[PDB]
């Protein structure tokens, strides 16, 4: 199959994996910090989605060093996955336009 679509699918499954692992590790890192809110796995998964999409409502965020490192990993994974989807769309469009120009 075309490399851009395979990479898009791989990035999707990798982002799902990163969301689950980030929820687990965020709860692990935040429990023990007085005042921490990112301490139950359901809302941790919600927060991981918020973080990967950059749609950060501000209802939840890490307060510890390791929670914030987990957050950075989730941020970069989400941003690069969505950018890879954009790149795959651009490649598809470029190929289609080349063909439409008979080249």
């Amino acid at each position: 199959s075309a490399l851009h679509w395979r990479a898009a699918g791989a990035a999707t499954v990798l982002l799902v994996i990163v969301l689950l692992a980030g929820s687990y590790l965020a709860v692990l890192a935040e429990r023990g910090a007085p005042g921490a809110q990112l301490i139950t796995y359901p809302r941790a998964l919600w927060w991981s989605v918020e973080t990967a999409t950059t749609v950060a409502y501000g209802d939840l965020y890490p307060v510890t060093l390791w929670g914030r490192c987990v957050a950075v990993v989730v941020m970069v994974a989400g941003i690069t996955s969505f950018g890879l989807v954009t790149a795959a769309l651009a490649t598809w469009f470029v190929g289609r336009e080349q063909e439409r120009r008979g080249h």
Partner: antibody
Amino acid sequence: QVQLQQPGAELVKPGASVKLSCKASGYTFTSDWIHWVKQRPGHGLEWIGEIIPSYGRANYNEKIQKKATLTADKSSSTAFMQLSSLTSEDSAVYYCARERGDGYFAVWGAGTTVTVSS
Amino acid sequence: DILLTQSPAILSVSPGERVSFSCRASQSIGTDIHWYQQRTNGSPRLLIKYASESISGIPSRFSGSGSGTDFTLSINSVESEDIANYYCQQSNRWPFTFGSGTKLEIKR
């Protein structure tokens, strides 16, 4: 079947230490947390600490003096709390409870009555 | 740490009357409150989770309400088996904390 099994009682001499056990059955998930709660006779419930057996990480109530050390054995599915250098203030019922990582204590053990006396 | 105030400490009610325990948090905690019942010589028993969600095996007589800082546990038509201490517990912020408990008394 009873989900959390605790011994009925432990007698401890002042200054000595004791290891309480909590054997878990039923569904076990990587998101499980085992909590320990202290209750003195005629008093309320006091949270001591928590441990996540899948990782071994333990957290403790910082408002009280740390007398407890939490461990877990995954093969036997048993959580342990070591109370050290006990005095009469440590005499109480100690419960273990299981939380599925979503904030509430779905199940409690029967509690171990710890008496500190000579 | 979040303080859970349960006042009054003792509730006295006639049989068959509706009763309401109060739990007030020192800060807003959404709906992250859970209610437990402890009878004499017994271990705590989860009655309500997340302020209002029912628990399997708990009589429909029990309900919960509230959000933010003020929460209520209600029993419609109290009966003798309800005589117990009732505790609220929050999971919004670390560490989890307990209320000081309210005892239910029945005037027969």
